[PDB]
Structure of Host translation inhibitor nsp1:
Amino acid sequence: VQLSLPVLQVRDVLVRGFGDSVEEVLSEARQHLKDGTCGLVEVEKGVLPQLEQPYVFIKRSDGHVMVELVAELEGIQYGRSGETLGVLVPHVGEIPVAYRKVLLRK
């Protein structure tokens, strides 16, 4: 529910997505958020081509930001929500540059 997500530099990320289908990446992202093993990469130019699809975005749903998960594959998004805060990735020990406090609608 209340989470502080480590913000990772894209070139440091070891595991660059959660899986191979929309349903799987949403499931795995939720599991990693629950387990405290989820990182956040901020979306800047050149970032997404360095990550693996389907993407899982964390989006503002409405000092902890209420967020919802939205997946994207082939330019189609699954879920509808607000401003993108970043793309979620597994965290396997990478050193963050910041944290993002979020309230995951769960």
In short: The longest helix spans residues 22-35. Helices lie at 22-35. The first strand starts at residue 2 and ends at 7.
